[PDB]
A = this chain, B = another copy of it.
Amino acid sequence: LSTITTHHLTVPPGLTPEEFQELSSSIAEFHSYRINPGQCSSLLAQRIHAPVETVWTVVRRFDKPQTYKHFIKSCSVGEDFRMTVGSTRDVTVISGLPAATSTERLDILDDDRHVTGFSIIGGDHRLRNYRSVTTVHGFERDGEIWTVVLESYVVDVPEGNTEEDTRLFADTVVKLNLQKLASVTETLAREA
């Protein structure tokens, strides 16, 4: 019943075909998931007019997701926290429901290829077993540079929800966070 995601075969909304053809191999490598019934997966994309390493400095900051994410009341890490795979963070989410904290584990951190990813290991019943990967990519035309960020996830569809409603919620949130990422990092680039 399990299948393989097809994100690497379709142009993500927002991206040009030409951008996608350059990214196709990277989507297969980092944005491919094993999907079972009762699960759903999406790939989202955002163009940013900022250098790759400027964007990556924000995307890799596992201890401060609120720097580019919405609906975060607080994020606490350990006193001996170090940016290593396997570290965790406790994220308190604003949702209008009673106070709910998610524990998230850092799954990937590749400073050379600009790939990171995390898993919600407990605490969010909207996004049970959420797993996500973000990659950053540089582009150039005629001395003009820009960056594309790709963010994908897989998550369990909660009992009582349709896939479309879980997908639409999770997509809307990723889309909004990527917009904030674009604004934050574009500002950082203009200021130098």
Interfacial residues, chain A to chain B (CB-CB below 8 A):
70-71, 73, 94-99, 126-127, 158, 160-162, 165-166, 168-170, 172, 176
Contacts and interface: CB of A to CB of B under 8 A. Distances in A.
A166 B96 contact: yes
A97 B161 contact: yes
Contact of A165 (B96, B127, B176): B96
Copies in the complex: 2
B94 A169 contact: yes
A159 to B, nearest CB: 10
B126 A176 contact: no
A81 B146 CA distance: 46
A71 B95 CA distance: 13
A71 B160 contact: no
Contacts of A168: 73, 94
B176 A96 contact: no
A51 B168 CA distance: 33
